[PDB]
Amino acid sequence: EKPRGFARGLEPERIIGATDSSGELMFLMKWKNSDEADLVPAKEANVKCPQVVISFYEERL
């Protein structure tokens, strides 16, 4: 298998939080119309939804 992350084909709603416990920066992403969030690489989020990433940083900050 079942799609995860950006491969679910859902619009990102908001970043719930960030973590780098795996070696690289990841974001816990909430998608529109789903209560199932999943971890996506920051490197992918930066490109695919920059404004969602920027909103997360700006609120903090």
């Binding site: 908001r14 970043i15 719930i16 939080g17 960030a18 973590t19 416990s21 816990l28 997360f56 609120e59 903090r60």
Partner: peptide, 7 residues
């Protein structure tokens, strides 16, 4: 398994 929150 730690997450920094929005915020």
């Amino acid at each position: 398994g730690t997450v920094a929150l929005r915020e």
